Design a protein around this ligand. Structure first.
Ligand SMILES: [Mg+2]
Ligand SMILES: [Mg+2]
Ligand SMILES: [Mg+2]
Ligand SMILES: [Mg+2]
Ligand SMILES: [Mg+2]
Ligand SMILES: [Mg+2]
Ligand SMILES: [Mg+2]
Ligand SMILES: [Mg+2]
Ligand SMILES: [Mg+2]
Ligand SMILES: [Mg+2]
Ligand SMILES: [Mg+2]
Ligand SMILES: [Mg+2]
Ligand SMILES: [Mg+2]
Ligand SMILES: [Mg+2]
Ligand SMILES: [Mg+2]
Ligand SMILES: [Mg+2]
Ligand SMILES: [Mg+2]
Ligand SMILES: [Mg+2]
Ligand SMILES: [Mg+2]
Ligand SMILES: [Mg+2]
Ligand SMILES: [Mg+2]
Ligand SMILES: [Mg+2]
Ligand SMILES: [Mg+2]
Ligand SMILES: [Mg+2]
Ligand SMILES: [Mg+2]
Ligand SMILES: [Mg+2]
Ligand SMILES: [Mg+2]
Ligand SMILES: [Mg+2]
Ligand SMILES: [Mg+2]
Ligand SMILES: [Mg+2]
Ligand SMILES: [Mg+2]
Ligand SMILES: [Mg+2]
Ligand SMILES: [Mg+2]
Ligand SMILES: [Mg+2]
Ligand SMILES: [Mg+2]
Ligand SMILES: [Mg+2]
Ligand SMILES: [Mg+2]
Ligand SMILES: [Mg+2]
Lengths: 119, 170, 46, 172, 203, 48, 116
RNA sequence: CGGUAGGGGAGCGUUCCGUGUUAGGGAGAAACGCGUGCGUGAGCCGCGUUGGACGAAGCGGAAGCGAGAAUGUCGGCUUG
RNA sequence: AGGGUGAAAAGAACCCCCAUCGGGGAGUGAAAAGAACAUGAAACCGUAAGCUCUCAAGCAGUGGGAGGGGGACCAGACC
C-alpha cells in the first residue's frame, strides 16, 4: 500500500516556522536554516535561564554596595553583610536591593540598627 | 433605518452628500452646556480616584523566597501543598514591616506578626522549554516543563504593633 | 637556542593560578551562631 | 462597507512583454501622481515600458469616466504594482558545447485609480470640527448615522482608527 | 512650510487628544527622592516590588544630572581616573544600571598639573598607529603634556569606561580643560568626593 | 572571479533601488520638457 | 586626453567622417532643411558655412573648390546662383539648429538643421 | 536520574483493511489557515468572512510508514 | 513531456478604452469558476499599514527592556 508522505512533513515544518518568526533575514524564511536557528534559540534560552539567576545576584549586590557606601566613610558591602549576619537578620539580596531603591530611608534605618547593636 | 437609508442613498446615488446623512436639524450642543458635558464625560471619562489600602508592607518568606507584599494585591508562589481554592492562610515568617510612620525590623523575625492571605488559585506556569543539546554528538532532547504554582491574595498584615519600632528621627 | 617552549596543556599546567601562601589556603567559611527556631512557613486557618 | 468600493477603479494589464524590473522603473514614478501629470510624463519618458503603461493608464481613465462616472481631473494613481508573469524559456548554444537559458519575462500590471473629491462632503465637514466638537456631534446620532458619517477616508488620513474604537464610538 | 490647512490642524488636534487620554490613565511618575514604597496609584499597577527595578525614561533625562569638578593639580593620574570612571558610569548610585546612563558629568581642570609617579614622565609611552605599515608614532608622556595635555586624561579615562555603544556615549560626559577655568558655571558644579588615601601626592 | 556567496535579499533590494532612482531624474526632465512644449513659445524646440 | 582638440568625431574614422559630412551638406543644399542627430548637425555647421562663404566670392577658383566637396554639380551651380542674392548681407551664421523629440529605436537625441 | 558507539523499555504519527453501506457531513467533509487550549515529546483537542464532497473516535490488523544532508534525484525559483 | 471551467458552453450580446491582444461594465451561471479557467503549500517577486536603523563591528539569537503602537476581558495580562 503506497504512502505519499503528504502533510506530515509540512505540518512539522510549519510548527517550526512559527517559532522562528521575527528572525532577521533568511533565518525567518528557509526551512533548513530555520531548523538550526530554532535549536540555537532554544539552547540559549536554556543557558540563560541559568545565567539569569547569576546576573541578578550580580546586580543586586552591586546596587547594595552603592546604597551603603554613602553612609560611613569606611563602610562596604562586605562589612554590611557580615554585620547583617552577626545580628541575625534573614533579608536576602533582592529585598535589600529593592528596598535600597524604592524605600531608601528604610535602608538607612537598618544600617542604624546594625550600628546601634555593634555599639 | 438611517443606516438602511444612508446606505441605499450612498448606493443608488453615487457621490454622497452631507445634508442627507446629517440633516440640518442638528446644531450640536453648545460647548459650555450640561448636555455637551454629559456626552463628553461619557466618551472621554476622567481617571477615577484610586481605591483605599492600608499604607503598609511586609517582607515575607514563602517557599524560601522573600516577597514584598502590599495588601490587596495578589502574588505568585510555589505550590502550597494541600491548599485549596478559597482558603484562608497565615504566613508566619515575617522579616520586615514598613509603615510610612515607622519600620519594624525582625531579629530574624517580627514576633507575633502574621500575614492573612487567601488562596485564590492553583495554576501551572507558562511552559518552559528545557532543551539539551550537544553539537555533532547527534543528541538533542526536547523537554517541556510546566511548574505548578499557587496564586494567593494578601488581605492584611497584623500583630506587629507591640514589637519595638525604629524610625529615622532628625 | 637549546631550550623549548610550553605548548598547550604543558603551558596550562605552568600558568594556572594558585594560592601558594600558606595562610590563604587554610582559610574558611565564617562561623555564625545558630538561628533560633523559626515558625511554620505557612499555616491553614479555618 | 469600505472606501475600496467607492473611490476605486482597478485595471489589470496582462502579459505585457516588459520585464518586471524595467516596468517597475516607470511605475515607481507615477505612483501617487495626478492623472494629468502622469499622462505628460509617460508621453515624454525615454523608456520603452512607458508606452504600454501609458495605454493602460489611459484605458483605466476611460473606465473611471464611462463606467463608475468619475471626473478625469480628480483622478490620481493611488496604488500601482507590477507582478511577474509567465516566463518563456529558450535554450541557446554557447562556446564548446555548453548551453544557456534565455528567459523572456512578462508581467501583469495593476493600476488603481482613486477619485479624491468623492467623500469630500464628509471630509471637509469633519475637518471643520475640533476633536471635542466632533465627539459631541456624534453623541446624538444612531449607530447607523455614526457608521455612515465616519465611513469616509477620514479615520485613516488623520490616524484616528484605533482611537475611536477605544472611545466606545463604534462596534466591530 | 507648515500647512495651516484644516487637515493638518485637525491631525495635530486629534493627536493632542490621544496624548491627553493616554496621560490621564497612565501611572504617574514619582521621582526617586525620599520616595516611599508606594503611591495608592501604583498599587493598581504592574509588579515592581517583586521584580528588579529598572529605570524608566523620566529618571535618566540628561538635564537632571549632577556636575562635578576635579582639580587635577597634584592628583595622581590613574587613581583619579578610577574615581572619575566610577562617577561617570553611575556605579555610586543605588539606582545603577549597566544598561543605562545614570551617571554624572565630570569636569577636569588644570590638566597639565596632573601628577605621575616614578620616571613615568619620561618613560610612559603613548603610541598611535596610522594603519599603513611603519605607521607607528610614539610620544613620551611629557612631549604630549607640552603639546596637547588634555589628551592624557581623556585617554586615561577612556580606558576605564566600558567599551561599545554605551561606553562611547558615556565618554562624552567627560569635559576636560587645560586651564584653571571652565565655562560651565551655569551647570553649578559640585566638587568630586575622593575616598582614596593615596590619591593626593605631596612633595 | 566568482561570487563566493549569494547576495542577501535586502542588499540586492537596495542596489536595484539605486538603479530605479535614475527613472526619477528622467521623470523630472520629462516633466520639465512637457511644461516647456505646453506653452508653444520655444523656437529652439519643434514637435510635429 | 584632449585639451583643445576641436574636431567632431561623430564616432567614425577619418575617411568615413569626411564622406559623411560632404554627403550631409549636399543634402542640406538640395532640400534646404533636414532631420539628423544632434552631433551630426553641430559638426556639420562648419562645412555648410565653408560652402556658403565659398559661393559668396564666386571665382572660378572657389567654384572648383566647392565642386570638389559637394557631390552633385547641379547643387553647386544653383548655390553660386542663389547665394549672392539670398545671403549677401548676412555676415556668417547661415544655419539654424532646432532640436526635437529623440528617436524611438535608440533614443538618440535628434535635431533639425535649417538653411537660414 | 551527563553521555558517543551501542543494548533495553514505553510511546506518537502516516496510508490502507476489519467493525462499516459506521457516528458525523452543501445547517460545509477532507484539506488549508489559525490558537492567551492540553501534553515529557512525537503530537492531540478546539476554531475559522478559506475550501466544495467525503469520512472520524474507540478496539484491532498490514505496510511502498516519518528526510536536512547521499558532488543524491526531478521540477520550480533565485544569486551573480 | 503536456490530465481535472461548469451540472449544462449556457464560452460572455451590447457600450466604453480600442490597430489586435488585453481590459472595465452589462448579460449567463449556485459561484467569474472567464477559457494560461477546480483545492492552490514553500521558495521567489512585490504593495499597503504599525514600530524602527545613517559613530557602526555583527553565525544575528537569547535573558534583561527604555520608548512607541495594537486587538482585550480576568483590564497587574496578551501581541
Ligand atoms: Mg493511496
Ligand atoms: Mg517516502
Ligand atoms: Mg522579539
Ligand atoms: Mg556522531
Ligand atoms: Mg626555540
Ligand atoms: Mg594562557
Ligand atoms: Mg579558598
Ligand atoms: Mg558546435
Ligand atoms: Mg553558458
Ligand atoms: Mg583610405
Ligand atoms: Mg574605409
Ligand atoms: Mg574656420
Ligand atoms: Mg547526576
Ligand atoms: Mg541518561
Ligand atoms: Mg545511542
Ligand atoms: Mg489520527
Ligand atoms: Mg487516513
Ligand atoms: Mg450515513
Ligand atoms: Mg472542519
Ligand atoms: Mg483521506
Ligand atoms: Mg488534529
Ligand atoms: Mg487519536
Ligand atoms: Mg458537489
Ligand atoms: Mg476506524
Ligand atoms: Mg487524519
Ligand atoms: Mg520503498
Ligand atoms: Mg531537498
Ligand atoms: Mg554545485
Ligand atoms: Mg535543480
Ligand atoms: Mg468582456
Ligand atoms: Mg495596423
Ligand atoms: Mg477582448
Ligand atoms: Mg456582471
Ligand atoms: Mg445572475
Ligand atoms: Mg487554481
Ligand atoms: Mg567616535
Ligand atoms: Mg545613531
Ligand atoms: Mg551594527
Amino acid at each position: 500500500t503506497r504512502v505519499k508522505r503528504g502533510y506530515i512533513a509540512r505540518r512539522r515544518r510549519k510548527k517550526i516556522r512559527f517559532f522562528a518568526s521575527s528572525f532577521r533575514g533568511a533565518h525567518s524564511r528557509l526551512t533548513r536554516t530555520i531548523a538550526q536557528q530554532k535549536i540555537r534559540a532554544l539552547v540559549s534560552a536554556h543557558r540563560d535561564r541559568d545565567r539569569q539567576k547569576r546576573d541578578f545576584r550580580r546586580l543586586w549586590i552591586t546596587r547594595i554596595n552603592a546604597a551603603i557606601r554613602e553612609r560611613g566613610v569606611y563602610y562596604n558591602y562586605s562589612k554590611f553583610i557580615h554585620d547583617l549576619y552577626k545580628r541575625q537578620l534573614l533579608l536576602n539580596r533582592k529585598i535589600l536591593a529593592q528596598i535600597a531603591i524604592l524605600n531608601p530611608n528604610c535602608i538607612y534605618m537598618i544600617y542604624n540598627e546594625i550600628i546601634k547593636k555593634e555599639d | 433605518l438611517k443606516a438602511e437609508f444612508e446606505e441605499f442613498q450612498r448606493p443608488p446615488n453615487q457621490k454622497p452628500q452631507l445634508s442627507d446623512v446629517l440633516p440640518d436639524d442638528f446644531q450640536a450642543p453648545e460647548p459650555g452646556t450640561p448636555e455637551y458635558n454629559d456626552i463628553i464625560n461619557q466618551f472621554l471619562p476622567k481617571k477615577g480616584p484610586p481605591p483605599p489600602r492600608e499604607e503598609i508592607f511586609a517582607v515575607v518568606v514563602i517557599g524560601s523566597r522573600q516577597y514584598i507584599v502590599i495588601p490587596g494585591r495578589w502574588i505568585y508562589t510555589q505550590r502550597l501543598k494541600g491548599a485549596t481554592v478559597n482558603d484562608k492562610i497565615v504566613l508566619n515568617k515575617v522579616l520586615l514591616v514598613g509603615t510610612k510612620a515607622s519600620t519594624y525590623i525582625g531579629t530574624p523575625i517580627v514576633t507575633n506578626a502574621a500575614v492573612h492571605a487567601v488562596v485564590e488559585e492553583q495554576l501551572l506556569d507558562d511552559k518552559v522549554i528545557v532543551f539539551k543539546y550537544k553539537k555533532k554528538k547527534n543528541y538533542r532532547r526536547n523537554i517541556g516543563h510546566r511548574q505548578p504554582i499557587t496564586r494567593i491574595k494578601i488581605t492584611g498584615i497584623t500583630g506587629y504593633e507591640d514589637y519595638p519600632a525604629s524610625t529615622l528621627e532628625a | 637556542s637549546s631550550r623549548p617552549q610550553k605548548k598547550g596543556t604543558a603551558h596550562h599546567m605552568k600558568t594556572r593560578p594558585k594560592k601558594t601562601a600558606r595562610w590563604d589556603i587554610k582559610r574558611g567559611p565564617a562561623v555564625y551562631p545558630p538561628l533560633p527556631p523559626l515558625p511554620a512557613e505557612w499555616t491553614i486557618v479555618s | 462597507p469600505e472606501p475600496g468600493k467607492c473611490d476605486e477603479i482597478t485595471t489589470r494589464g496582462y502579459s505585457i512583454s516588459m520585464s518586471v524590473d524595467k516596468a517597475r522603473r516607470v511605475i515607481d514614478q507615477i505612483r501617487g501622481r495626478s492623472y494629468a501629470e502622469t499622462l505628460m510624463i509617460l508621453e515624454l519618458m525615454p523608456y520603452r515600458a512607458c508606452y504600454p503603461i501609458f495605454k493602460l493608464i489611459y484605458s483605466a481613465a476611460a473606465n473611471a469616466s464611462h463606467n463608475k462616472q468619475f471626473n478625469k481631473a480628480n483622478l490620481i494613481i493611488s496604488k500601482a504594482e507590477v507582478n511577474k508573469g509567465i516566463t518563456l524559456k529558450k535554450v541557446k548554444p554557447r562556446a564548446r558545447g555548453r548551453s544557456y537559458m534565455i528567459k523572456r519575462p512578462t508581467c501583469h500590471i495593476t493600476i488603481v485609480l482613486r477619485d479624491i473629491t468623492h467623500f469630500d462632503s464628509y471630509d471637509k465637514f469633519l475637518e471643520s470640527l475640533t476633536p471635542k466638537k466632533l465627539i459631541a456631534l456624534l453623541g446624538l446620532m444612531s449607530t447607523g448615522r455614526r457608521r455612515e458619517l465616519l465611513c469616509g477616508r477620514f479615520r485613516e488620513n488623520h490616524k484616528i482608527k484605533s482611537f475611536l474604537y477605544k472611545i466606545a464610538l463604534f462596534k466591530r | 512650510r507648515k500647512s495651516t490647512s484644516a487637515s493638518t490642524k485637525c491631525t495635530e488636534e486629534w493627536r493632542q487628544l490621544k496624548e491627553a487620554v493616554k496621560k490621564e490613565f497612565a501611572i504617574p511618575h514619582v521621582p526617586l527622592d525620599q520616595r516611599w514604597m508606594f503611591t495608592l496609584e501604583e498599587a493598581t499597577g504592574p509588579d515592581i516590588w517583586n521584580t528588579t527595578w529598572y529605570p524608566k525614561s523620566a529618571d535618566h533625562v540628561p538635564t537632571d544630572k549632577k556636575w562635578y569638578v576635579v582639580d587635577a593639580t597634584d592628583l595622581i593620574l590613574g587613581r583619579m581616573a578610577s574615581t572619575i570612571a566610577i562617577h561617570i558610569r553611575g556605579k555610586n548610585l543605588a539606582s545603577y544600571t549597566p544598561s543605562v546612563d545614570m551617571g554624572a558629568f565630570v569636569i577636569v581642570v588644570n590638566a597639565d598639573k596632573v601628577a605621575v609617579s616614578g620616571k613615568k614622565r619620561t618613560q610612559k609611552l603613548y603610541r598611535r598607529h596610522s594603519g599603513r605599515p611603519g605607521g607607528l608614532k610614539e610620544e613620551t608622556f611629557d612631549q604630549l603634556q607640552k603639546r596637547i595635555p588634555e589628551r592624557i586624561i581623556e585617554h586615561a579615562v577612556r580606558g576605564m569606561l566600558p567599551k561599545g555603544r554605551l561606553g562611547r556615549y558615556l565618554f562624552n560626559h567627560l569635559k576636560v580643560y587645560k586651564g584653571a577655568e571652565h565655562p560651565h558655571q551655569a551647570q553649578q558644579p559640585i566638587d568630586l568626593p575622593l575616598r582614596d588615601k593615596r590619591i593626593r601626592v605631596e612633595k | 572571479a566568482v561570487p563566493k556567496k549569494r547576495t542577501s535579499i535586502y542588499k540586492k533590494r537596495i542596489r536595484k533601488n539605486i538603479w530605479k532612482k535614475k527613472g526619477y531624474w528622467a521623470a523630472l526632465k520629462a516633466f520639465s520638457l512637457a511644461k516647456s512644449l505646453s506653452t508653444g513659445n520655444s523656437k529652439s524646440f519643434f514637435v510635429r | 586626453m584632449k585639451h583643445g582638440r576641436k574636431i567632431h568625431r561623430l564616432s567614425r574614422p577619418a575617411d568615413q567622417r569626411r564622406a559623411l559630412l560632404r554627403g550631409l551638406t549636399t543634402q542640406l543644399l538640395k532640400h534646404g532643411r533636414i532631420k539628423t542627430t544632434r552631433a551630426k548637425a553641430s559638426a556639420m555647421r562648419k562645412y555648410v558655412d565653408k560652402m556658403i562663404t565659398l559661393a559668396k566670392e564666386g571665382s572660378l577658383h572657389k567654384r572648383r573648390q566647392a565642386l570638389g566637396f559637394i557631390y552633385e554639380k547641379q547643387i553647386v551651380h544653383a548655390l553660386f546662383a542663389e547665394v549672392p542674392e539670398r545671403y549677401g548681407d548676412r555676415n556668417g551664421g547661415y544655419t539654424r539648429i532646432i532640436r526635437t523629440l529623440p528617436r524611438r529605436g535608440d533614443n538618440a537625441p535628434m535635431a533639425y538643421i535649417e538653411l537660414v
